[PDB]
A paper describes a structure:
In bacteria, RuvA, RuvB, and RuvC are involved in processing the HJ. RuvA was shown to assemble into a tetramer for recognizing the HJ core and recruits RuvB. As a motor protein, RuvB can bind the dsDNA part of the HJ and promote the movement of HJ, known as branch migration. RuvB belongs to the AAA+ (ATPase associated with various cellular activities) family, which includes many members involved in numerous physiological processes.
To understand the mechanisms of RuvB recruitment to the HJ DNA by RuvA, we reconstituted the complex of RuvA-RuvB-HJ DNA for structural analysis. To our surprise, we only obtained a structure of RuvA-HJ DNA. Lastly, RuvB is loaded onto HJ DNA by interacting with RuvA, which assembles as a tetramer to bind to the HJ core.
Residue numbers in the entry:
A (entry chain C), C (entry chain A), D (entry chain D): 1 to 140
B (entry chain B): 1 to 139
The structure:
Amino acid sequence: MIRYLRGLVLKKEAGGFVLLAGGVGFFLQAPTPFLQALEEGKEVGVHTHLLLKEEGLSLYGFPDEENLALFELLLSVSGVGPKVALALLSALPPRLLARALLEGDARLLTSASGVGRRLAERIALELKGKVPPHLLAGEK
Amino acid sequence: MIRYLRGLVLKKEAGGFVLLAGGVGFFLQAPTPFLQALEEGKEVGVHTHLLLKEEGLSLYGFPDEENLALFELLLSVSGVGPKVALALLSALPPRLLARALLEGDARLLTSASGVGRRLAERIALELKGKVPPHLLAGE
Amino acid sequence: MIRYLRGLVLKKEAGGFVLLAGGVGFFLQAPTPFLQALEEGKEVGVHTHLLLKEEGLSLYGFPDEENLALFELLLSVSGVGPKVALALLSALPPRLLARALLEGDARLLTSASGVGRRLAERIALELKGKVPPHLLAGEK
Amino acid sequence: MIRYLRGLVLKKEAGGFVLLAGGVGFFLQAPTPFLQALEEGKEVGVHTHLLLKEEGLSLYGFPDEENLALFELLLSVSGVGPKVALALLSALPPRLLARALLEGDARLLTSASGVGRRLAERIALELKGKVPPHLLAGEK
DNA sequence: ATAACTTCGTATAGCATACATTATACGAACTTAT
DNA sequence: ATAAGTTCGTATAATGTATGCTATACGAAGTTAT
DNA sequence: ATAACTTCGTATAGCATACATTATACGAACTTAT
DNA sequence: ATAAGTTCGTATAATGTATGCTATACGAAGTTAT
């Protein structure tokens, strides 16, 4: 339904984050690691998904560029509840998406501050070595 | 999903009002003293939460950068009408700033009226400990 | 939530029309005497009321100049838009409600054709008689 | 509710594409001949019915000149299994309207393929006066 | 005892689509002037 | 008795909806000769 | 003559509670001044 | 010896089987010179 909304924001919350278009303001919670950066700007480039029933409407969050690969890999739709799907994903340590990734897939669902999800062979092949180019740093 | 609309109002209704914006015409139900102080000459910073119940699909309003999360007090099984669905303020004690809502935990809002319920263990925990710069004024 | 739509309209259909407010196009079904003459000419001040149904969702775009009292009077919790408040104006097409009301509020809403709507419409005496409106003609 | 969307498109995907000119980014799934190498105009205009449910969170699109009658004629039972209906399954083969459904208003939907049952009496009334002479080649 | 206050109590709200489209151009029988 | 209105209760047409079978790479029959 | 040349179509598992599994911050366990 | 002290063990996020029904005009009590 919704992908890659841009909005506007100048605010950060410990468990929250919002997007403004000027007249309406969207609320989107992004994965915990990268919220320490990527706060101020005219665009945050967030992918979305949402629940439709029983008073639970709230857009989800994911990093800039394109990272729905993360959501597809870590959906866990089998009755996990909204308390997890919004934020508790990074089983990987991507700190800049170009510094710790592509290191022989050891930092690609192999060994990190996670639980050992025991899944691979899909994102790694799809990666096609696009990690290095022009991502050596982040953004404010 | 939606939070912190903005704009200016031109109409006043006993049940609520509407917000002037591009596209659709946004409908907003807000507490009674808030709407009286929020005329066309005051900017309408509604911090909606969109409490939806079938036909009751409408936004809501609150004083700008204040009094938000009244849902923590007004959580209920089913809101029969707007008069319980966040169109309050006729009742709870403080007015014109919600300054007496905490008052440094000196007075609690539960026993000031017969419509509230005993929630002393939850009223105290609020940003009041940070001593916000809100003080008596025309706000 | 939505009350006062504004946007672009250029089409006339036997079941209704469409409204373009940029980005999306809203589908609106005006009452029978309204759309039969008033279709296009500017960003029309067509009002709004949403509906819930199992086999159809749309808008109902009531006439301009604050005529939503019509839907408010004719709506029931068990009613359906295509069959209620939109099919209750045939055999009674007042060309202009301001003309039919000015100094004739009681007459038009009391002694007109029909024997069913009056029981509820008796409230509508005071709704429109506020100020002299600029409804001397239509639009095309 | 929503009909005749329009916005910014720059991406081609095997399932569909996105539309994010203003506010959210709408996900659009065009039919097979359109999706087969019709992409990236200035702005694209697509119809829909907004058949959005809990499991399926996508909305569909169709050629930029009318053709919601195509969805009306293509309406199929949307089962649990994917790749059914979803704006796909275009029985007609045409490269474009004027290219391969001209020469009368019956040839467009007579003896096309498969079943081969004529259904002109329902559809021939709409595009007969607008298909020629434009729309001879695809838009890049 | 009662007029004119002041003060305390009380102070909104009707309807079942118990499968989801209340219908536009014909025949029968009149009625007049054919 | 029928030519020509007139009226009304006759009365639309197949519409179009609501928890689970589709894409793909393999055998193979038959080609052509004797 | 055997071998060498057209056509050629089809082999992803889990649906049946939708409410118990996970970031942190106290603590026993270490070195050395009898 | 040993207390303190190093580094790994500890610990929190729903009510769906569910939905129909508290609501601001004026009724009633009390004092004085009517």
